[PDB]
Amino acid sequence: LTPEQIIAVDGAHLWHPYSSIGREAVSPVVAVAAHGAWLTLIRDGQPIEVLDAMSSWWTAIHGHGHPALDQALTTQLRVMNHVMFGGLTHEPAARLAKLLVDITPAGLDTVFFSDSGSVSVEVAAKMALQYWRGRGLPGKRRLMTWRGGYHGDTFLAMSICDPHGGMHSLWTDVLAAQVFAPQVPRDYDPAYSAAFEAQLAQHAGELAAVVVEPVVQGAGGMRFHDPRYLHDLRDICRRYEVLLIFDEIATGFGRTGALFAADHAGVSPDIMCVGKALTGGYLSLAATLCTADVAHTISAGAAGALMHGPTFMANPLACAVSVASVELLLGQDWRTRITELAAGLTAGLDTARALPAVTDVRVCGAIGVIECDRPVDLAVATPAALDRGVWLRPFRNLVYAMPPYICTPAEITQITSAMVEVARLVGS
Amino acid sequence: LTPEQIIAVDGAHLWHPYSSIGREAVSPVVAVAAHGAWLTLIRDGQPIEVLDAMSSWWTAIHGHGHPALDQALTTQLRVMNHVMFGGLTHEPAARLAKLLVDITPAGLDTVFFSDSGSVSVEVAAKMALQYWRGRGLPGKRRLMTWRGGYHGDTFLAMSICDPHGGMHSLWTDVLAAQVFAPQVPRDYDPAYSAAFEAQLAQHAGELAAVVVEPVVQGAGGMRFHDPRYLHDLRDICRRYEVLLIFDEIATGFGRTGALFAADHAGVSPDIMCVGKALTGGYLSLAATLCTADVAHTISAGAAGALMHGPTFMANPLACAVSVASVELLLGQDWRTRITELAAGLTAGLDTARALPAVTDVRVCGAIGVIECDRPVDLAVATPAALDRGVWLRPFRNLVYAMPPYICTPAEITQITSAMVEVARLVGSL
Numbered sequence: 001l002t003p004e005q006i007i008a009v010d011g012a013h014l015w016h017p018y019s020s021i022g023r024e025a026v027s028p029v030v031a032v033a034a035h036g037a038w039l040t041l042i043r044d045g046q047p048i049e050v051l052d053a054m055s056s057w058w059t060a061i062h063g064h065g066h067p068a069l070d071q072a073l074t075t076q077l078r079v080m081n082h083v084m085f086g087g088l089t090h091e092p093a094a095r096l097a098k099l100l101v102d103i104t105p106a107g108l109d110t111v112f113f114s115d116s117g118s119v120s121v122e123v124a125a126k127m128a129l130q131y132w133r134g135r136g137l138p139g140k141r142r143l144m145t146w147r148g149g150y151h152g153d154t155f156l157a158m159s160i161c162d163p164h165g166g167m168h169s170l171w172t173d174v175l176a177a178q179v180f181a182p183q184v185p186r187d188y189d190p191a192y193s194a195a196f197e198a199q200l201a202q203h204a205g206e207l208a209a210v211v212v213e214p215v216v217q218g219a220g221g222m223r224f225h226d227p228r229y230l231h232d233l234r235d236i237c238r239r240y241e242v243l244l245i246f247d248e249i250a251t252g253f254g255r256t257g258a259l260f261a262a263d264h265a266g267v268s269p270d271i272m273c274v275g276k277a278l279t280g281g282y283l284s285l286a287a288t289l290c291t292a293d294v295a296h297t298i299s300a301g302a303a304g305a306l307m308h309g310p311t312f313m314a315n316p317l318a319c320a321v322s323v324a325s326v327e328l329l330l331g332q333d334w335r336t337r338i339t340e341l342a343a344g345l346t347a348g349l350d351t352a353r354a355l356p357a358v359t360d361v362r363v364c365g366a367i368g369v370i371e372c373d374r375p376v377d378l379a380v381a382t383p384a385a386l387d388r389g390v391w392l393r394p395f396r397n398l399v400y401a402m403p404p405y406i407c408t409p410a411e412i413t414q415i416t417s418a419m420v421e422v423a424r425l426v427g428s
Numbered sequence: 429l430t431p432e433q434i435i436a437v438d439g440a441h442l443w444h445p446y447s448s449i450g451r452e453a454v455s456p457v458v459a460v461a462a463h464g465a466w467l468t469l470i471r472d473g474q475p476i477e478v479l480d481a482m483s484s485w486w487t488a489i490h491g492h493g494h495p496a497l498d499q500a501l502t503t504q505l506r507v508m509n510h511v512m513f514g515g516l517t518h519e520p521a522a523r524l525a526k527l528l529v530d531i532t533p534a535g536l537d538t539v540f541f542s543d544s545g546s547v548s549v550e551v552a553a554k555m556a557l558q559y560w561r562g563r564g565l566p567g568k569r570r571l572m573t574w575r576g577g578y579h580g581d582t583f584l585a586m587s588i589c590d591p592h593g594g595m596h597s598l599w600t601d602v603l604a605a606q607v608f609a610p611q612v613p614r615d616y617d618p619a620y621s622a623a624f625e626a627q628l629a630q631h632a633g634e635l636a637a638v639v640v641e642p643v644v645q646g647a648g649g650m651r652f653h654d655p656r657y658l659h660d661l662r663d664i665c666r667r668y669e670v671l672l673i674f675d676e677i678a679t680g681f682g683r684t685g686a687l688f689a690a691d692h693a694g695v696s697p698d699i700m701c702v703g704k705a706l707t708g709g710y711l712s713l714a715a716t717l718c719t720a721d722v723a724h725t726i727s728a729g730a731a732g733a734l735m736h737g738p739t740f741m742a743n744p745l746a747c748a749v750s751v752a753s754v755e756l757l758l759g760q761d762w763r764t765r766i767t768e769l770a771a772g773l774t775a776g777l778d779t780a781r782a783l784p785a786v787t788d789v790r791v792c793g794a795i796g797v798i799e800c801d802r803p804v805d806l807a808v809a810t811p812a813a814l815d816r817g818v819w820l821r822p823f824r825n826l827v828y829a830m831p832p833y834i835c836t837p838a839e840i841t842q843i844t845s846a847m848v849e850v851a852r853l854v855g856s857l
């Protein structure tokens with residue numbers, strides 16, 4: 001198909017994330033290749049090379065078409081594409097489970113593979129609910145979180161997303177009614193944690209779990225919070241016998257400057273979700289980890305089992321690529337790499353602080369954010385960044401990047417320069 | 429890792445479908461290769477080749493490691509592994525969407541890609557709920573189905589699964605309360621449809637959709653029903669203004685003898701889900717299709733968009749292998765292939781009818797079921813089939829297969845013989 005033919009088919013037949021059919025303000029741009037940190041996009045009938053500043057929605061940590069990851073896929077393809085995980089096991093699943101148990105916060109000893117982040121969150125909730133039912137406390141079935149969060153798009157996951165960001169107003173009478181604490185602040189305030197505890201105290205008997213994104217909240221507003229809040233959450237959850245669940249689907253695998261964001265606080269949750277960067281952005285795969293205690297309690301319960309089992313559970317191809325991606329990350333000095341990337345983002349975005357339409361500039365690991373004083377018009381921002389050789393996708397009032405770890409210092413400054421120029425145009 | 433090392437890691441660290449940690453009756457069997465219709469499994473330290481009678485849970489329709497499908501993946505890998513679908517589009521998505529709108533029941537004009545069947549079902553429900561909210565009818569928010577069904581494991585999908593199979597009694601006060609009609613019978617009875625209609629009529633003002641598996645109910649009990657029931661559902665839904673959703677995640681792509689099970693009835697749903705065999709069993713991918721009316725009504729609604737968007741939406745690699753798998757199916761005489769498979773299954777399983785413990789033997793396309801009068805002992809049945817060169821996974825009182833379309837008559841003979849033998853062993857207590 002030609003790019004023009006692709007556009008015609010797309011406009012007629014393809015839904016996009018959070019999109020309409022037939023009411024799009026701008027056509028999507030045709031992507032024809034991806035290699036390293038670069039995408040080849042069609043603009044005015046011509047191929048152009050642009051930096052993937054978004055890592056293709058947090059996924060492409062090692063860039064596209066990395067030789068080690070490409071080879072991991074084709075090596076596995078030669079032997080076994082897939083087998084059902086019901087009654088069978090295999091080397092890719094075992095290798096990946098061993099790795100994940102080793103590198104995640106201490107105590108996360110069992111691994112449930114699924115096919116997406118939203119599913120992994122539903123699995124986490126199911127683990128928590130079956131856990132309490134295994135303890136003879138079925139009343140513990142609600143979830144508590146703080147505002148500003150995002151946990152996916154399936155119906156239970158929706159229930160713990162930020163009520164405003166998640167448009168809960170459109171879902172009246174449909175979603176499970178969960179417990180929401182106020183937005184967690186950036187700076188550490190003991191009064192916030194005291195208030196969180198006071199609220200949890202009123203609901204402890206009906207709460208299965210607290211579920212949060214640690215350190216960085218992604219789709220709900222690219223907000224950062226002091227890691228000390230995670231200490232407090234761990235303490236509150238321990239004292240009130242409520243499970244702690246960390247959704248690290250966006251934060252995992254080095255993105256915030258620690259291997260997992262929980263590591264910034266030395267905190268171990270009872271249950272943990274991972275996903276976006278798990279396969280280095282090749283293939284859909286997610287995992288939910290839980291402690292031995294949680295696993296045993298579920299296993300000794302009425303069902304005698306966790307009542308979940310995806311068709312493509314532990315897919316050999318996805319697991320094989322994930323093994324290679326995780327090993328590639330661990331086999332290099334990733335911490336120095338992310339530190340250098342963060343320094344590049346900080347240096348490159350500093351000039352944005354003086355722009356008339358800029359409210360805040362913030363960086364956490366390989367994440368850089370320009371917060372603007374108005375919603376960013378994509379019809380202007382997207383081509384402006386493309387004109388500067390960068391693929392950027394703002395949302396709401398935020399111009400942000402989470403670049404591939406393989407970006408050179410020069411590429412990082414090209415990304416930040418495009419971001420600054422987008423922010424300048426916002427104020428025009 | 430060696431097979432022994434894999435078993436040690438697995439026992440300590442790996443959940444399996446609907447399994448425990450540390451309380452498994454039997455260890456899983458280590459799989460070390462898969463090629464065509466055959467799995468290589470480790471049995472007493474040694475690699476043995478056995479027939480994948482289950483198609484690895486409906487997925488492996490063309491068998492494992494099909495050269496065309498391997499090639500499609502490798503080809504796409506060299507160009508573009510993945511890009512975000514937010515603000516970008518690409519050839520594999522466009523090619524697959526075009527194929528799917530062309531081959532699915534008439535009127536299904538738009539395609540929402542996701543990463544699994546359960547998600548595709550939740551997308552379908554979201555489409556239905558946003559549709560009615562876009563019509564100023566937010567009260568239409570419940571779902572209706574018949575018993576015996578399976579729609580996935582996410583919490584909304586659970587709510588429309590069979591209450592027994594889905595263990596609803598363990599989920600008291602957690603699940604959405606949906607409307608259940610009685611188990612749909614095998615043989616066509618207009619009285620069943622009339623009763624379904626009367627029940628729906630009472631709830632019409634609060635119902636967004638009827639959601640069913642067409643012709644074959646899979647995980648809820650491997651039951652078949654007359655296609656005319658689907659004709660009735662289409663009619664009822666039309667007259668009472670309730671959307672019709674067909675979950676073809678297990679039935680799609682030729683499995684029941686028609687390209688889609690809906691085709692047996694000659695009706696189109698408003699919304700349709702596909703998944704298990706979409707990529708020919710290589711990779712997780714699913715799709716939810718809906719009519720232009722549904723799409724336009726959502727798009728004109730309060731959000732102005734369908735409020736859903738998975739990270740790996742329309743993944744180029746998965747889409748590329750799916751295009752290859754669908755083209756491979758369409759480029760051959762698949763109808764004759766499935767008819768031959770159905771005939772082979774019928775011929776091979778016919779002897780089981782006379783067995784003491786067997787209550788029913790039924791075949792529908794490339795699906796064969798022996799139903800027993802008592803639960804099948806998995807600790808006995810699994811090695812019994814393996815000893816005969818076949819991987820089978822019974823559950824409850826059912827010994828069944830959904831073999832790859834590439835299975836030869838000799839391979840079908842081997843599969844059915846193992847099934848009959850498992851059923852023979854059931855009768856001996």
Ligand SMILES: O=C1C=Cc2cc(N3CCN(C(=O)c4cccc(Cl)c4)CC3)ccc21
Binds near residue numbers: 311313576577593
């Ligand atoms: O290999 C596999 C890949 C997925 C999978 C699932 C699976 N299940 C899920 C469905 N199932 C149920 O009993 C079930 C559960 C809930 C509701 C309903 Cl209606 C029936 C049997 C076990 C077995 C094996 C595999």
Ligand SMILES: O=C1C=Cc2cc(N3CCN(C(=O)c4cccc(Cl)c4)CC3)ccc21
Binds near residue numbers: 395
């Ligand atoms: O390329 C993409 C792949 C997935 C994706 C999602 C996506 N979103 C999802 C989240 N989002 C939200 O506004 C949102 C929605 C609900 C709740 C909450 Cl808290 C925030 C922005 C748009 C944009 C782009 C892509």
Ligand SMILES: *Cc1c(COP(=O)(O)O)cnc(C)c1O
Binds near residue numbers: 121153248737
């Ligand atoms: C993206 C995301 C999810 C959902 O993942 P999908 O693969 O899109 O279903 C859940 N939680 C967090 C924190 C995420 O960033």
Ligand SMILES: *Cc1c(COP(=O)(O)O)cnc(C)c1O
Binds near residue numbers: 311641647703
């Ligand atoms: C397996 C199945 C699902 C769920 O698919 P997953 O990929 O396991 O989430 C939904 N509906 C039907 C009819 C199925 O057979």
Ligand SMILES: [Cl-]
């Ligand atoms: Cl080449």
